[PDB]
């Protein structure tokens, strides 16, 4: 369980890029600050759903 805490420490302040095909415009890729969650699914913010 300590390695998960370590992983929380690692990703601190860093962001990841989300992409959805087809990528029609530059907002087809966006940057998000990741919040670690249980489960195998990626969680996306509602407001960006239109751009993607």
């Amino acid at each position: 369980d300590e390695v998960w805490d370590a992983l929380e420490e690692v990703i601190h302040g860093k962001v990841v890029l989300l992409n959805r095909a087809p990528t029609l415009h530059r907002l087809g890729i966006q940057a998000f600050q990741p919040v670690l969650v249980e489960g195998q699914s990626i969680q996306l913010h509602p407001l960006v759903c239109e751009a993607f």
Binding site: D5, E9, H12, G13, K14
Partner: protein
């Protein structure tokens, strides 16, 4: 949204220049181990661990806040690269 992003965009004629300044400053901080910071002990960015408040590992955050303070000077042809690097290594060894 990143804190004071509009004001940061204010400081530059081009957003990409802001990005370059932030990135390079972050490289300086990483290289010299944060001991060359312009921040004050109470201005230092913090991170909550299980233990408690610790220094923020992220150098980009540091660089952006430092830039927001105004104590940093950025531009083109301010100083030869070698001289800068050596003076920095003299003031803050590795």
């Amino acid at each position: 949204a990143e804190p004071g992003i509009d004001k940061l965009f204010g400081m530059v004629d081009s957003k990409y220049r802001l990005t370059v300044v932030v990135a390079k400053r972050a490289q300086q901080l990483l290289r010299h181990g944060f001991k060359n910071t312009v921040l004050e002990p109470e201005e230092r960015p913090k991170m909550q661990t299980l233990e408690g408040l610790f220094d923020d590992p992220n150098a980009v955050t540091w660089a952006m806040k430092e830039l927001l303070t105004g104590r940093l000077v950025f531009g083109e042809n301010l100083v030869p690269e070698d001289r800068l690097q050596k003076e920095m290594e003299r003031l803050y060894p590795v």
